[PDB]
Amino acid sequence: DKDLLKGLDQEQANEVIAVLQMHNIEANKIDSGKLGYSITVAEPDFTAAVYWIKTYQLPPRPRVEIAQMFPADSLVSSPRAEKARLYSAIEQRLEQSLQTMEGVLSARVHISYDIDAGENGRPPKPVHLSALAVYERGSPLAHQISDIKRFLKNSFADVDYDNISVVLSERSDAQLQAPGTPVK
Amino acid sequence: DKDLLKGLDQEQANEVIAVLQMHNIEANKIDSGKLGYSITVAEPDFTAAVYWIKTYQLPPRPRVEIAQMFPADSLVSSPRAEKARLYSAIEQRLEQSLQTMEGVLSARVHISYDIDAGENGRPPKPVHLSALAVYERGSPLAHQISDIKRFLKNSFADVDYDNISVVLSERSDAQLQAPGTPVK
Amino acid sequence: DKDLLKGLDQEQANEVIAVLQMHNIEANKIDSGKLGYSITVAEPDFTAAVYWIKTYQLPPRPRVEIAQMFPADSLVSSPRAEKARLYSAIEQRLEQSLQTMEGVLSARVHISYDIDAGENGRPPKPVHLSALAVYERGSPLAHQISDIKRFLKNSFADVDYDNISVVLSERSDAQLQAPGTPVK
Amino acid sequence: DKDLLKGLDQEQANEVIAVLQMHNIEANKIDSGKLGYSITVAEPDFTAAVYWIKTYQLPPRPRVEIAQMFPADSLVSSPRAEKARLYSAIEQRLEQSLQTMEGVLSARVHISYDIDAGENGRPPKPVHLSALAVYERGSPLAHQISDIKRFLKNSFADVDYDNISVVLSERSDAQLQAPGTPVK
Amino acid sequence: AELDSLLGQEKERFQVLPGRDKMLYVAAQNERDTLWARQVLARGDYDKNARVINENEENKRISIWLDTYYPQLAYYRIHFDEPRKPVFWLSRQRNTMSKKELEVLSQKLRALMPYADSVNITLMDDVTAAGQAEAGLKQQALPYSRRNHKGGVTFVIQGALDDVEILRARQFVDSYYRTWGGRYVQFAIELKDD
Amino acid sequence: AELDSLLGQEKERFQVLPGRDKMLYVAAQNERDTLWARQVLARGDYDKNARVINENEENKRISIWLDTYYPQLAYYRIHFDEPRKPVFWLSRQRNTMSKKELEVLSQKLRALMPYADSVNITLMDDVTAAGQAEAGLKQQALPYSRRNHKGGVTFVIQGALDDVEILRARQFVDSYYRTWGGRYVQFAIELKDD
Amino acid sequence: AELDSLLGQEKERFQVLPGRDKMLYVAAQNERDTLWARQVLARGDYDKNARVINENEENKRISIWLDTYYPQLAYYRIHFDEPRKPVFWLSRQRNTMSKKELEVLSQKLRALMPYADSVNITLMDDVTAAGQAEAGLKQQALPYSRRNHKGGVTFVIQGALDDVEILRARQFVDSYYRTWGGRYVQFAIELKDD
Amino acid sequence: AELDSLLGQEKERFQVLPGRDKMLYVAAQNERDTLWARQVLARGDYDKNARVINENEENKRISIWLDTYYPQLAYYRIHFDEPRKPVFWLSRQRNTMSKKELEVLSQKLRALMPYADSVNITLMDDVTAAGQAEAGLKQQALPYSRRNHKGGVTFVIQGALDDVEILRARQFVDSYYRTWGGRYVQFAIELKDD
């Protein structure tokens, strides 16, 4: 019955419980209205519960993307700002599209940004990409490394296959057991 | 009777149930008026229900398209903004048209964007495309990979067949069984 | 008696029923006044009804066309905006005209757009077209692929027959049986 | 029952307890409303508790990033400010993406900044990167030093593998024991 | 309530077969009618055991069985035009099985399918399987290229093709894959420019 | 409550095997149905001991056992088409084990699997394992390159490839890895430009 | 309360071994399940002495003991596939220990591990340890370079490598380090440009 | 209250040794657990005299004693794998001490450590100390340079090095400094450009 986090949001609270239940301590999510959520664990498990907050850097800061810093509410805009807000929405759209392939669970894509491509008379340099993936297990993931590498090739102007690197792994082993209350 | 998500919208709630019913836990969708929906599962299945939220990154963030960041409500506009808002509506219209072919259930199309085509005296580079598809099963999907590749060829200025890559698969096996309440 | 969608519009509701009645579950359309419609299915069929919402991406987002993003209510206009609003109305008019041929039930036409045709001193490139069709069955649809290809040839400045690709199919087999209530 | 810190925030308080419980003294976190938290330790352990505040420089000052000093609320902006606010959000996004690889717990990425690249007629110099990581133990971390070094290569314009240096280690040994109250 | 009334209004698209392992099977003729009958057996308004077997899926089920116990067997396809007496097509020029163990092969395919009474194994000429695939392809006036090798033949169709030459292609492939199956001759529709 | 009613509505996708060490096993046929049955045994609505064994995962479990006590053994894959009598494929041309200790190998694989009654060890020809991998690959009209060496063979597929030539590739790899396993011949789909 | 009920719902992932020094050991099979069982013994809901031993960490514990009392000993790895009778692999061509003190080596490894009954020391051929590391590496089609010297061998892999050639690398390293250990042959994946 | 209950929950990481000068010692195995046990003895909840001795710090304590009374002695390191009978490693080829005063050296190291019963002085071969440091260094594929001289050897490692070649370096240095100590051979990781 000892608090360790309070004032959390919704997705910040449903993941801390997924961390603590993986390491065999049982947590409770208590709603508190407009003040956000709060997480309390048992008193014999309070020492271990603080150590797995420091280690995983919990609670999660919200995920930051490039268009959040170049907002559309500005009165004026620059050609540097419109390009970095355009590539920031292609980059979000490609990871929305990798999640609908067979067996993919999550994905993150990165795009190389050109800032002084046309501002000093350079030709624009070639585009590079990189991707991550977390597959459902049982899949021969040595062979599905080429379908991502084919799908991402002709989604831009001119890339090569030696310029795309996708790094993928299988998901962790499932947690289906209740943790267990400390018997006193 | 333990909450795990609340404040959801309509399409964010009808998919989380489709996730949890696939993994043999039964969820309930409780309306709460103007505060959005909420999803509660049984108490023996609360551990497994949190693990399949962290894995699939649920609830789904809404799908982001290029025209949402270059709005028409601006007082001024640029030639960079009008081209990226035009290609963003051809890209939505092509995936509206792939869903009416025989056997297609969902599709996503991507277009390569030119930003300094005419701003520095370049000729405009060739257009590349890429597409996804989820077919109804039983279809010989080695042969329907050319009809998409023919339909997308002369929808633009000048593409080649080595510049269009469509990657498609069959849908997953159907879920028609009720999950089953935990007997206590 | 379990809801799965509410707040729908008219054409979004008459199609979800056409999806669910094809897969042998019976749905009911309940009007609710100014709040839109709502669809409820039986309680033994609730598991299958959620799976066919996730698969077909229901409810349908409204069909998007190019003139919806370049509105006529703007105070100023550009030559890039007037051309893309003109081709967007030829493209709607051609699919209104394919539906009145014999045996055609639905059609969708696409036009290739020129954006920097005259803005940098290029000659305007040749126009490409593409079309879809869903025929009434019993028709020899190997022979009616040339009448569409003749009708679309001289509707523009100068196209060739190797630049028009029409891809057509026959409609699906008819659903005329009542689904059947779950006997308990 | 002697105070040593008061007025702390939430994440400043859940880490000082993780420091003091690692060195076998037991601390208590007392909420005090809108005045922030406060940490009190036992009276025989007050000497050791002050020494581990001076050594680790506790409480933690909040983590400082480049975009906090070039805010978007300014009326005017410069090309020097927009580039250093763009690289500051790529740098945050790359460390959000390293935390979802298998076995990674925390990561920090740094980017080399160009300030007079185009302001005096230089060509822009090559981009350098550097990264840190804290792995879950049991992993052969001599082999996962190349997957980070492959993922970070084509996330920018043109880097080389002799320009990326990632330095990683395994996490410390776990603290799962209660410290123990001073018997008097 | 007998199962033939729990199905649709027409008692025509579904034919109900009594099994041998005290189970009662439902035979549908395409994939869309399989999900019609599997929805009934999944909501649970039938007290006994039942299945839904399909013409396409009962082929892929015992092709897994036959790829484990009897490898190196050259067969074509199993036809269910009457489901109580299925026909097992089998190649003639590529097997040396005698008269006696062909009866053993039939008496074990009977054990996989409890709805069948006997399996009629016939042997057909192997040259005519590649004969109808070529003579039917020259009739459609399509460009092609034959590549003979040991244990199979393949037909390669490339080049820039208008839709008259790939609509007639896909109607001939899907009507040939139904009859002979895709284990001896496989088509290659690759559409590239020149 | 017997376990075959605690599972789904169809008593068809799951087959329940009585063990020998007073435990009761559940055999699922793919990975998605393994998480269906492991969710039941983890919420704890069964008073006795039970497991869920999978066709893929029961191979990787006793491949760890067989890589410790019997090294240098050339085997292919274990098939569970009927789970009470599994089939242990074994290479012929790369082992010199006599008649007597092949019985000892079977009587110790029986001890690892309490649900099985006997393990049928068969010996198959090693040349035909590389024969079906090549003759099936020329039928798909794919470019390749054979690299023979002692104790294994590999097929390298590089070059710029359109999606017709890598969709037919991945459907042939995954249907070949199910039958023969990836211990003797391993494919190399590397997609680079030129 | 016996300890096998204080653990999780499945009494399957944990096997409880009675010791010899009046202590009761818990054997987990990976690192994530070690922190599951050490959390139970640390909150203190067990009145007696207990430990959690891991397959990886019980190797690194008595490798410290064996690097102090018996230096210059060429060994490979200790396998715990059944924990009551562990197997101590030992090199043949690099030691001159006679028959008698190999019994002395086994009777002192028994004293380090109170859960074991006897330690089975076996001698294996040293050439085949470098034989499977090379023949498994040519099968993955990777560039390499062998550097033989006295008392060990190393494989150097450099050059610009795409992800097909470093995903197949890291899956072969981690499956080889589990079997043979990293004391005789060590791999060198260094990724630089050219 | 006996001291083994005033420590943590596990009575496993700390082993309590009865002394000989009416003091009671606590042996910890790393530096972090030394501050755990010294915090107990400093708040003063024990009525008798106690210490906390560490494996690293009990070496540096009597290396000061041995650098005053017995200079010019070539020794390596003292191991405490069992603390009641420590092992004093000693070089063979660099000392001319006879049989009798080696007993005198052991009977005075016993007087420094009241927790020990006897000190076992052994003599080891000096060439193999520089043998394992070089053969272990060629296995990691690192560039180096040997500089032999009288009374010691040193290994110089310079040049521009990526992190694969300095992560494998620092894992080999710290595992070698634990066994042999840094009195005969000392490594030189100097990282400069070229």
Residue numbers in the entry:
A (entry chain e), B (entry chain f), C (entry chain g), D (entry chain d): 20 to 203
E (entry chain I), F (entry chain H), G (entry chain G), H (entry chain F): 171 to 364
Publication text:
The 24-fold features of the IM rings in the C1 reconstruction were clearly visible and further C24 symmetry averaging resulted in a reconstruction to 3.6 Å resolution (compared to 4.3 Å for the basal body IM rings; EMD-8398) allowing for refinement of the atomic structures of the periplasmic domains of PrgH171–364 and PrgK20–203. Consistent with the conserved dimensions of the IM rings between the needle complex here and that of the previous basal body reconstructions, the refined PrgH and PrgK ring atomic models determined from each overlap closely (overall Cα RMSD 0.7 Å) suggesting an inherently highly stable structure with no significant conformational change required in this region upon needle assembly. The N-terminal N0 and N1 domains, outer β-barrel and C-terminal surface exposed S domain conversely show very little structural difference between assembly states; as with the static IM ring components they appear to provide a highly stable scaffold or shell to buttress the inner conformational changes required for needle passage.
The injectisome is a specialized bacterial organelle that utilizes a type III secretion system (T3SS) to translocate effector proteins from the bacterial cytosol directly into a eukaryotic host. Composed of >20 different proteins, the injectisome forms a syringe shaped nanomachine that spans both bacterial membranes and that of the infected host. To address this and further elucidate the structural basis for injectisome assembly and function, including that of the central needle component, we have conducted here a cryo-EM analysis of the assembled native needle complex resulting in 3D reconstructions of the IM and OM rings at resolutions permitting atomic model building (3.6 Å and 3.9 Å, respectively) and the 3D reconstruction of an isolated helical needle filament at 3.3 Å resolution.
